[PDB]
Structure formats: C-alpha cells, structure tokens
Design a binder for this molecule. Structure first.
Ligand SMILES: O=C(c1ccco1)N1CCN(C(=O)C2CC2)CC1
Ligand SMILES: [Cl-]
Ligand SMILES: [Zn+2]
Ligand SMILES: [Zn+2]
Length: 567
C-alpha cells in the first residue's frame, strides 16, 4: 500500500512542510487520511432567456439556474461464486471486444490535437512547452519502473477527479484506444452505443423490442462509481492481457498505481487540504470512466441474465460443471444476449429471454450494483412498450411523416430542455460567444427536437436573432455547423439513416411532422396557454430586441419556414 502511494504523499508533504498537520478530528472513515496543509456557479444565457419569455414564470425552468456522503462508503467483498462468474465473464468479454480491434498506444500528437480543439496558464500552453514533456518522460520512466510520483487526484450524484495534464496524458497514452478506436461501438460490442447520436438510440431500442422475450428492464444503480469493487478493477485490468511490449507495461502501471491505489487532495472548510487514499471505487478520466463503466455494466447484466436463465444455482460457490456451463452459455449464446441490451456506461436497457430476470437479484446485489428507488429484494418493474423505456435521460416516440416514412425521435420533459439551454458555465463570455452558444442549443433543437412545437419555434427565433454566419460554440454533434439545418436534417434522418429505405429528400420544414398536440402537452409543451400564444404571435418583436442588443449585423428571418408565419 504505502509502498505505492508513499512517494506521492512524501512529495506533497514537502511542498507544504510549513503546514503539514495530522489532524485528529478528520471526517474520513472509509478513506485513509494521511495529513493536511494550508490552502463555479451556473450563469444565465441572456440570448436564450430573452427568446423564451413564457418560461420566466415556470419554476421547473427558473430554479435550474439557481444555487459527499456517498464517496465515504464501503462495498463488501463479493462471495466466491460471484467472483468466479465475474472473472469468467470478463475474460470472455475482453476476448470478444478484441476479436476485431488491436489495442495500441495513443500519441502526443493525438493528445496535442485534442487540447488544441478543446507554470503554464492553459493546456494549449503546456502541450507546446517541451519542459512539460520532459516531466511526462520522468513519470513515464517511473511507471515502467513500477512507481508513481505526480499522478494525484483532486476532488470537486456527481464527483469529478481532475489530475494535472501530464497524468491525463499517461492515462490517454495507455487506455485512450478504448474510446479513440470505438471498442464500445454497437458493431463491435453488440450492447454498446458509443458514437450513436440521440437520433440512433430510439431505433436501437425499437430493434431490441423486436426480440422475443420478456419486459424491457431499465434499472438505475444507486451511485454506480461508488459501487465499483477492487474485484471489478482487477477484471477491467485484464484488457492488458491483450497488449504487448511497452504498452502492456504502461497500461499495467495506470491500473496498479492510479486506479487500484488512489491519492486524492480534498478541500475541507474546517481550510486544510486533505490528502486521502483508497483502493476501490471509480476515479479515472471521464472518457476512460465511460468505457470501463460500459464494460463492467455489460458483464453484470450478462450475469443477471445467466441467473434468470438458471445457468448457476447459487453465488455462494460455483461447482466445476457450473463453470463449464457458464463458459458454454457464453460461447453458445453470449453474443445473442449482448444484442438484447443497450448499455451506455452505468445506464442499461435489457430485454431478457423472459421475466425470471425481474427476481434474479442475488448476483446483482452481491456484486454491489444495488438498484436505486426499490427495496433490495423487490422484483424489478419492467416496461411493456419500448416508447416508455427511459435511456440516456430520454424516451423515444414513433412519428409517421405525412408521406408514410417512420421517424423514431428522442424526447424529454420540455422544461428540462429549456432550463438547460438558459445556462452557461464559466466567466468572461462576450455577447457574441453567448449568442453562438444559444445558436448551438437552437440547432440541436432543430435536429433532435423538431417534433416539439415550442422548440421548433424557439430554435427558428434564436437562429433569426443571431447573425446568420456566426459559428455555433461549445454521441454525435451534427448541429455544430454553419450548413443549412434543412440540409443537415436530410443527411441525418434520411440519407445516412439505415432504418429509412426510401431516400427521397424533404424539400421544406413543413414536410417534417410534430408529435400529436396532446402528446406535446404531456411532454411539457405550453401550447394552449395564453402566454405561449402571445409569445408566438409577437415573436418578431423578441427577435428584434435581441438583434438591437447585438447590433447592425447580417441576419436571416427563419420564421416563414413555419406555416403560421408564411403570410
Ligand atoms: O391551442 C391553441 C393552438 C394553437 C395551435 C394549435 O393549438 N390555441 C390557439 C391559440 N390560442 C389563442 O390565441 C388564445 C388566446 C390564447 C389558444 C388556443
Ligand atoms: Cl409500459
Ligand atoms: Zn504516476
Ligand atoms: Zn416525449
């Protein structure tokens, strides 16, 4: 333990030798405390808020802009039968994921290009300073030597662990391939959805619905990242078994020194910097966190499926022939069972063979993946209709175009969409940068949420209010473009859509349908309210208010793309 974390602890004690104090009133039980030393609210987007006036009196919108007891927890050691199921399943899953992919190191060039597209002031500055890279080299050579000096986390149902850019590089070099080479694409992982836009996710859920079987289950885990066991981290580490030479050694060091042993500096108002350590839980880059969460979720859900199908009798202990049965299940039907699932990190949808899955809870609870908002042994409540299943914060509607073609569209409560577009993060936004962020939300709404009456109108208004040539600023983001949004809509929903056989382009926005008016209201629309009527009728006055603030620029009127403003 301290042989792996001591050097990092020693180095920090020195940069604060006139403060090091072993507080005895420390608030840590599950985190090991080592010592102490002496040591970003949401802003409103004015462009979006001025063009969404009716929502100024909707508390579900307005409260979103205003204003850890789970990290300090301890998950128990799984039983021996549970550990066997996880090791057999993880071994088989890394082999399947690796059948058509080659693990490889990511490069300083790739890392530099990422930072250049979002002592040293910023990341862009450090990437260019050859002094930085000489620091990376020292740490790198130390990792090859099996030791760590500078890979330390900083803390800040969310908890984000920043490290310095150098440590982030070493993580990206060893494990970036998982994301950069799409190991969790649907084509490669079967259950995954990595690189699938919101315009794909509903079609994927409808394809899972077409399988014979039981209800669709979408159980959320209570604090997934806090329930990652040291056994989970050891099964995730087995990806290094597919690696070779240097890469194998560099990846092994990231898992050993930074994931399976962690050093964290947390601020305590009491102000002292708390240097704490622990072996378990998730604490990695957010992108590596997504892939390893997807992997360990796919494993956990296949084991729950095995439990429901009776592949093993008890988690207490696998018999020798139960192990052969688990292996033979994976080889015989593993790829089919993966295709019965849609898994995005800690978020899953599973269509099992039948509803025995609902009460198959012993492995899931013993792995520590305890379900949110339900008693530990109460059977899961499944969904009978793919259009009601929650996934990635959405549900999905089946929408038939006047010409008979079928759109499967993403949806969520409209107060959440408007309340999020009204918020910026960070300081020093110019009026132009605030306008270009509003334009990014407006174009996302035109592409993904065109079927919501209020959002198509508000999107058209924002795009009318912001200069036509200004570039939108700050999954697939096809809305981040200055191309005409009708041309982008045709490319995404018709041309490139593998579920649409007839490729006839749409010639105008009037061909593109809305939800039913009652369904639009059920999902949050203000259609029918006097306020919404006054907003819609007077929208050119709101557009002109924003144009007057931005000043004398080139603007386009997009409002006559809608039937009601077309004379
Ligand atoms: O519900 C609707 C409507 C508009 C489009 C589809 O349905 N309306 C018409 C506009 N309205 C008004 O002008 C009334 C003064 C509020 C409210 C009733
Ligand atoms: Cl249902
Ligand atoms: Zn290190
Ligand atoms: Zn909806």
């Amino acid at each position: 333990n301290l042989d792996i974390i001591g050097k990092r602890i020693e180095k920090i004690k020195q940069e604060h030798e006139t403060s090091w104090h072993y507080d005895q009133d420390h608030p840590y039980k599950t985190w090991a405390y080592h010592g102490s030393y002496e040591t970003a609210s949401s802003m409103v987007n004015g462009v979006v808020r001025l063009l969404t006036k009716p929502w100024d009196i909707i508390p579900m919108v307005t409260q979103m802009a205003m204003t850890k007891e789970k990290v300090d927890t301890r998950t128990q050691e799984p039983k021996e039968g549970t550990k066997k199921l996880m090791k057999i399943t993880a071994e088989w899953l890394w082999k399947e994921l690796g059948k058509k992919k080659t693990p490889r190191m990511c490069t300083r060039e790739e890392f530099t290009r990422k930072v250049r597209s979002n002592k040293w002031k910023s990341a862009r500055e450090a990437v260019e300073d050859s002094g930085f890279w000489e620091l990376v080299d020292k740490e790198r050579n130390l990792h090859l030597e099996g030791k760590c000096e500078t890979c330390v986390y900083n803390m800040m149902s969310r908890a984000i662990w920043y490290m310095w850019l150098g440590a982030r590089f070493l993580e990206f070099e060893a494990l970036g391939f998982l994301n950069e080479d799409h190991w969790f694409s649907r084509e490669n992982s079967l259950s995954g959805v990595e690189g699938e836009g919101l315009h794909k996710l509903g079609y994927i859920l409808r394809d899972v619905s077409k399988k014979e079987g039981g209800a669709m289950y979408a159980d959320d885990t209570a604090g997934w990242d806090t329930r990652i066991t040291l056994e989970d981290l050891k099964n995730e580490e087995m990806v290094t078994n597919h690696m070779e030479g240097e890469h194998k050694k560099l990846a092994e060091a990231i898992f050993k020194l930074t994931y399976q042993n962690k050093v964290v500096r947390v601020q305590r108002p009491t102000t002292v910097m708390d240097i704490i350590s622990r072996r378990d839980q998730r604490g990695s880059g957010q992108v590596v966190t997504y892939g390893l969460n997807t992997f360990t979720n796919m494993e956990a859900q296949l084991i729950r499926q095995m439990e429901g199908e009776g592949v093993f009798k008890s988690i207490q202990h696998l018999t020798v022939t139960e192990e052969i049965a688990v292996k033979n299940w994976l080889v015989r039907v593993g790829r089919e069972r993966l295709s019965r699932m849609a898994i995005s990190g800690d978020d899953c949808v599973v269509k099992p063979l039948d509803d025995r899955f609902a009460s198959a809870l012993t492995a899931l609870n013993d792995m520590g993946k305890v379900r949110k908002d339900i008693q530990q042994w109460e059977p899961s409540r499944g969904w009978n209709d793919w259009t009601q299943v929650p996934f990635c914060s959405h549900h999905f509607h089946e929408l038939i175009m006047k010409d008979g073609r079928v759109l499967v569209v993403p949806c969520r409560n409209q107060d959440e969409l408007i309340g999020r577009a009204r918020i910026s993060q960070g300081a020093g936004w110019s009026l132009r940068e605030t306008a270009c962020l509003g334009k990014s939300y407006a174009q996302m709404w035109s592409l993904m949420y065109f079927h919501r009456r209020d959002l198509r109108l508000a999107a058209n208004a924002i795009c009318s209010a912001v200069p036509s040539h200004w570039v939108p600023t700050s999954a697939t983001h096809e809305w981040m473009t200055t191309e005409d949004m009708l041309t982008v809509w045709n490319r995404v929903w018709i041309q490139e859509n593998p579920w649409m056989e007839d490729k006839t382009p749409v010639e105008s926005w009037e061909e593109i349908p809305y939800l039913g008016k009652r369904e639009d209201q059920w999902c949050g629309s203000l259609i029918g309210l006097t306020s919404r009527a006054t907003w819609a009728k007077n929208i050119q006055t709101a557009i002109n208010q924003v144009r007057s603030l931005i000043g004398n620029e080139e603007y386009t009127d997009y409002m006559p793309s809608m039937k009601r403003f077309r004379r």
